[PDB]
């Protein structure tokens, strides 16, 4: 995703 | 050559989308409690329940207006999870292909009808 | 006036960090298969298992050397996930405050002892 963001 | 025919066609296409397993992540707004950084990336959230409601309320004047909201569902999915190996990326690609294949005839039939009017 | 006292103090502080829930993402190296863009952003990876191992092997000559490795864990965390609304940002801020509050007296005790020698 976007760093330790996003969905998987 | 019916300029109203797209309304019921789009209603039935959305019914088919809600029945497809691949639509599950997109059936309701993204959960901002579960993903609190979502609004740092995404300007305008969108989901199929909102699209269905906007149609039912008669707030789309043309099928191209409806297509703009659906495009945003897939634009937001890619922006927040761009990884080509993720489950949501593959679900997005298959459901996008399914939508485009069924909407193409709805748009061309509507454009034909509009010429006549 | 004990110049060796910092070794066991830092061992106990690392034990306290490993038991804090906020440390979970930092207990082992970032997985570069799960995050293949990580080394595009991060020049020098660091984690609490590497720090603990370096200490146990006696490869730190002073507590300031250990402190600068721990600060790199929080520098890397903010660089890769800067979103102030993300869960990892708030975990980083709390664990960093906890570390700084406990390391300060380890550093000042060591500096006092060093002056004497």
Stated resolution in angstroms: 2.0
Cα–Cα distance, C32 to B109 (Å, whole number) = 50
* Token output for C67: 């402190």
Chain B positions touching C90 (Cβ under 8 A) are none
Cα–Cα distance, B110 to B64 (Å, whole number) = 10
Beta carbons of B11 and B103 less than 8 angstroms apart: no
Q: Closest by alpha carbon to C110, among C10, C12, C9, C2? A: C2
Structure solved via: X-ray
Chain A positions touching B42 (Cβ under 8 A) are none
Q: Is the dihedral of CA C81, C82, C83, C89 positive or negative?
A: positive
Contacts of C108 (CB under 8 A, 6+ apart): none
Q: Is the dihedral of CA B27, B31, B34, B38 positive or negative?
A: positive
Beta carbons of A1 and B81 less than 8 angstroms apart: yes
Neighbours of chain B (3+ CB pairs under 8 A): A, C
CA-based nearest distance C57→chain B, Å: 39
C25 inside 8 A of chain A by CB: yes
Query: DSSP character for B58?
Result: T
Beta carbons of C48 and C18 less than 8 angstroms apart: yes
Chain A positions touching C83 (Cβ under 8 A) are 2-3, 5
* Token output for C105: 């007296």
Q: If 0-12 CB within 10 Å is exposed, 13-18 middle and 19+ buried, where does residue B4 land?
A: exposed
Chain B positions touching C83 (Cβ under 8 A) are 37, 40
Q: Closest by alpha carbon to C76, among A6, A3, B38? A: A3
Task: Name the B residues in 20-39 with CB < 8 Å from any C CB.
Answer: 36-37, 39
Contacts of C56 (CB under 8 A, 6+ apart): none
Cα–Cα distance, A5 to C80 (Å, whole number) = 10
Indicate the helix (H) or strand (E) that contains B8: helix B5-19
């Amino acid at each position: 995703g976007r760093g330790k963001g996003g969905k998987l | 050559y019916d300029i109203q025919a797209w309304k019921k066609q789009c209603e039935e296409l959305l019914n088919l989308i809600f029945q497809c397993e691949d639509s599950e992540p997109f059936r309701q707004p993204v959960d901002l409690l579960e993903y609190p950084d979502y609004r740092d990336i995404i300007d305008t959230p969108m989901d199929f329940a909102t699209v269905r409601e906007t149609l039912e309320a008669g707030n789309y004047e043309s099928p191209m207006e409806l297509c703009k909201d659906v495009r945003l569902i897939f634009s937001n999915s890619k922006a927040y999870t761009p990884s080509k190996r993720s489950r949501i990326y593959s679900m997005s690609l298959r459901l996008s292909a399914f939508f485009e294949e069924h909407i193409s005839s709805v748009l061309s039939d509507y454009k034909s009808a509009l010429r006549f009017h």
